[PDB]
Design a protein around this ligand. Structure first.
Ligand SMILES: O=C(Nc1nccs1)C(=O)NC1CCCC1
Ligand SMILES: [Co+2]
Ligand SMILES: [Co+2]
Ligand SMILES: [Co+2]
Length: 260
């Protein structure tokens, strides 16, 4: 749908909160911490300090506040008090906060302790795949073009794009239309218009594209057990570009992108 300025104002708030959860949690992502504790830290911050709520907690049956996906876990990794992070791990923490009725959805990769060459590369390339997509967002561009660009970039770096999961519209709803595929598909025919709000969250595997759902029904792993990485931002299409609503202090892309 198309958001009104009033709606967007609220999404800036929700987006900022979600981004601040990732900024706040970064220092905590080190060797020895459990994903369960990280989840608790995020939730306590969201509820007690931001006076907001995790959109993930309870969503479609999800049992935790954030999704934490380590190494080969592609997405929806369930925080676990017994799962400890260690040197070299690449970890995605996907956050979604609701505030004043609107959602802010974002994720980033954290590398624990000493990064491995491939781990740093996969994360960097993945973030750049998101950045290149964000730099294309403007009225008139077709979402299919963005998916094509992401895939082309990722595969040229020897990595694969997960097909199953995609970006999504967002607002009062967590996952609204349209679907934002991260690969070229004729199924995609959406011309961007001002006011549209959605996410871009490419999941990239170091190995093959195939994935598999684990026994908990949420955790997804690469079929070949290769490393996987993902970054995500929620944006609003502006009259001549876009505004990243979940920009962080560490992001290396501007919040307001304009074309012409
Ligand atoms: O439900 C999804 N993600 C969640 N993260 C935390 C709680 S729920 C999700 O990505 N769903 C998509 C796959 C099916 C429909 C869209
Ligand atoms: Co999800
Ligand atoms: Co997300
Ligand atoms: Co999302």
């Amino acid at each position: 749908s198309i958001k009104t300025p009033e709606d967007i104002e609220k999404m800036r708030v929700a987006g900022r909160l979600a981004a601040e959860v990732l900024e706040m949690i970064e220092p905590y992502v080190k060797p020895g911490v459990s994903t369960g504790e990280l989840d608790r830290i995020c939730n306590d911050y969201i509820v007690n300090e931001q006076h907001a709520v995790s959109a993930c907690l309870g969503y479609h049956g999800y049992p935790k506040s954030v999704c934490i996906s380590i190494n080969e876990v592609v997405c929806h990794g369930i925080p676990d008090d017994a799962k400890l992070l260690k040197d070299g791990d690449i970890v995605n923490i996907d956050v979604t906060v609701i505030k004043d009725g609107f959602h802010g959805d974002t994720s980033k990769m954290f590398i624990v302790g000493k990064p491995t060459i491939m781990g740093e590369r996969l994360c960097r390339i993945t973030q750049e795949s998101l950045y290149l997509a964000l730099r294309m967002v403007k009225p008139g561009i077709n979402l299919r073009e963005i998916g094509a660009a992401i895939q082309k970039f990722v595969e040229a770096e020897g990595f694969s794009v997960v097909r199953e999961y995609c970006g999504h519209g967002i607002g009062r709803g967590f996952h609204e239309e349209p679907q934002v595929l991260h690969y070229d598909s004729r199924e995609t025919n959406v011309v961007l218009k001002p006011g549209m709000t959605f996410t871009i969250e490419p999941m990239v595997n170091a190995g093959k594209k195939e994935i598999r759902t684990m026994k908990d029904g949420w955790t997804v792993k690469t079929k070949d057990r290769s490393l996987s990485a993902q970054y995500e931002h929620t944006i609003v299409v502006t009259d001549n570009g876009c505004e990243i609503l979940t920009l962080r202090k560490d992001d290396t892309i501007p919040a307001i992108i304009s074309h012409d």
